[PDB]
Swiss-Prot record, chain A:
Family as reported in the entry's similarity comment: Belongs to the RNA polymerase beta' chain family.
Cellular localization per UniProt: Nucleus, Nucleolus
Subunit and partners: Component of the RNA polymerase I (Pol I) complex consisting of at least 13 subunits.
Protein name: DNA-directed RNA polymerase I subunit rpa1
Superkingdom of the organism of origin: Eukaryota
Role played: DNA-dependent RNA polymerase catalyzes the transcription of DNA into RNA using the four ribonucleoside triphosphates as substrates. Largest and catalytic core component of RNA polymerase I which synthesizes ribosomal RNA precursors. Forms the polymerase active center together with the second largest subunit. A single stranded DNA template strand of the promoter is positioned within the central active site cleft of Pol I.
Swiss-Prot record, chain B:
Assembly mode: Component of the RNA polymerase I (Pol I) and RNA polymerase III (Pol III) complexes consisting of 14 and 17 subunits, respectively.
A Gene Ontology cellular-component term: RNA polymerase III complex
Protein name (Swiss-Prot/TrEMBL): DNA-directed RNA polymerases I and III subunit RPAC2
Statement: the UniProt record of this protein carries the keyword Transcription: yes
GO molecular function per UniProt: DNA binding; DNA-directed RNA polymerase activity; protein dimerization activity
Annotated organism of origin: Schizosaccharomyces pombe (strain 972 / ATCC 24843) (Fission yeast)
Recorded family membership: Belongs to the archaeal Rpo11/eukaryotic RPB11/RPC19 RNA polymerase subunit family.
Parent-record interval covered: 20 to 114 of 125
Function: DNA-dependent RNA polymerase catalyzes the transcription of DNA into RNA using the four ribonucleoside triphosphates as substrates. Common core component of RNA polymerases I and III which synthesize ribosomal RNA precursors and small RNAs, such as 5S rRNA and tRNAs, respectively.
Transcription found in the keyword field: yes
UniProtKB/Swiss-Prot annotation, chain D:
GO molecular function: DNA binding; DNA-directed RNA polymerase activity
Protein name from the UniProt record: DNA-directed RNA polymerases I, II, and III subunit RPABC3
Assembly description: Component of the RNA polymerase I (Pol I), RNA polymerase II (Pol II) and RNA polymerase III (Pol III) complexes consisting of 14, 12 and 17 subunits, respectively. Directly interacts with POLR2A.
Annotated compartments: Nucleus
InterPro entries, alphabetized: NA-bd_OB-fold, RPABC3
GO cellular component: a single term: RNA polymerase II, core complex
Keyword tags: DNA-binding, DNA-directed RNA polymerase, Nucleus, Transcription
Residue numbers spanned by region Non-specific ssDNA binding: 15-37
Disulfide bridge positions per record: none
Swiss-Prot record, chain E:
Protein name, entry field: DNA-directed RNA polymerases I, II, and III subunit RPABC2
Biological process annotations from GO: DNA-templated transcription elongation; transcription by RNA polymerase I; transcription by RNA polymerase II; transcription elongation by RNA polymerase I; tRNA transcription by RNA polymerase III
Keywords tagged on the record: DNA-directed RNA polymerase, Nucleus, Phosphoprotein, Transcription
Organism: Schizosaccharomyces pombe (strain 972 / ATCC 24843)
Post-translational modification: Phosphorylated.
Statement: the UniProt record of this protein carries the keyword Manganese: no
Family, per entry: Belongs to the archaeal Rpo6/eukaryotic RPB6 RNA polymerase subunit family.
Full-length numbering of the shown residues: 61 to 142 of 142
Gene name in the database record: rpb6
Taxonomy, superkingdom: Eukaryota
Gene Ontology terms, MF aspect: DNA binding; DNA-directed RNA polymerase activity
Subunit structure: Component of the RNA polymerase I (Pol I), RNA polymerase II (Pol II) and RNA polymerase III (Pol III) complexes consisting of at least 14, 12 and 17 subunits, respectively.
GO cellular component entries: cytosol; nucleus; RNA polymerase I complex; RNA polymerase II, core complex; RNA polymerase II, holoenzyme; RNA polymerase III complex
Amino acid sequence: TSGDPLRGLIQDHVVMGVWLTCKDTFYTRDEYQQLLFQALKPDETGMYGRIKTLPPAIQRPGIYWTGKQIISSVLLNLKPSDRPGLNLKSKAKVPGKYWSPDSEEGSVLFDDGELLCGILDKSSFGASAFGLVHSVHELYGPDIA
Amino acid sequence: EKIIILPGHSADLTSVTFQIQKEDHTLGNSLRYVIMKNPEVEFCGYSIPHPSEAKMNFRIQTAPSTTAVDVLRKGLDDLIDLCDAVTEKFTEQLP
Amino acid sequence: YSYSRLINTNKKVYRHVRNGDMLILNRQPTLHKPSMMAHKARILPGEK
Amino acid sequence: ESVLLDEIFTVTSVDKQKYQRVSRITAVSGQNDMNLTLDINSQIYPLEKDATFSLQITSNLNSPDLKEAADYIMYGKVYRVEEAKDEKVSVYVSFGGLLMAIEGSHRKLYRLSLDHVYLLLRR
Amino acid sequence: GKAVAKEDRTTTPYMTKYERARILGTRALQISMNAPVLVDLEGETDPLQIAMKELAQKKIPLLVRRYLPDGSYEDWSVAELI
């Protein structure tokens, strides 16, 4: 009927999205690797040999990967053979004022396939166009979306 | 068939995915914890295909120095040593 | 009889579904085309 | 040598708005021609108002400076570089979420690019 | 009826979303009925994904006849389509 996509995640996944991509989150190495491998689960799907990660966002006094880096990591492992990374700018559902006065999150910007600023919610991945998942459907073809 | 190597293993046997049969998080999480304590590992994260069946996909990737099977063996030995340390302290506590 | 393609045919085994067979799903009432789709089957043990 | 900043900073305001962890701090310093506002992990590296800095953004973190200096090290891409209102540039460095915005007068802020950073903050 | 000549062909050079499915389907059926595989197998078993391996390299027979609404038709080799 209209272009607006109909597939996409629902209640629990999207609330946990607002809570994972939020910027006060932090992971140690163990949680990062474990959560990533739970996400990917290559062997049941296949086609990929070894899982590759990012450097940590912060390095001292304790090494900590952040949440947006986990989203960027998933996007990095699902990039096709040779397609440059995703880059995109789009308003998110959680309005900017809820986080702070003149808050930065607001609107997801991410270049070359790394989630630079902004949190993912019902507008990003779900029954809302021009988000992350729809742009993956446009760039990297349907079976990757 | 307790432990097998899945068809995704690198030829150098450095990026390999054991699949432990009839196990759930009970050993998976503990062994992952002990394996992370090993410097020469880059990645170690377990999963479960579907809670209906009892199979645990493991995954261990390491630096080119030492292969992965040696890492799994050393990690299991370390976990056994940990269990023994706990049982020794416990037994020595009460008369 | 003398119509010889009976040598070219193969023996057809009816096989069960397996983890890659594509089996349609539907729901009545099926209003619009995204309502009848085709999913890959993955065969789980246990549940009914 | 690939260091892109050596400026000493001083903090002026800290918040700490709806976040128990990372807090945005604004740390205008120099001859007030260096306006820096970043986020920091305020659970493992705390900072108060008017605490001194030693901020450097390098390119490759391979030197004894890593061990001696750099009491706190982040890492991230610089995604937006603008020149507005003057011969005065504003740089936006993302650190995987924890943002940072540094406004400097096109000098002492010349070597900035659109690649990764390795920020170093030593008190 | 007319078989439109090769010099002037007015149909779209793209393998339409439908010709791909039916070409792969009929090639899969053919290979399932003990036909020649034109490309080296690497151990794949399904009599269809072999046809995907054939089409990935454009090593497949079976030109298609596109029936225009006049009643005429074009003859496109599956090597010839985009």
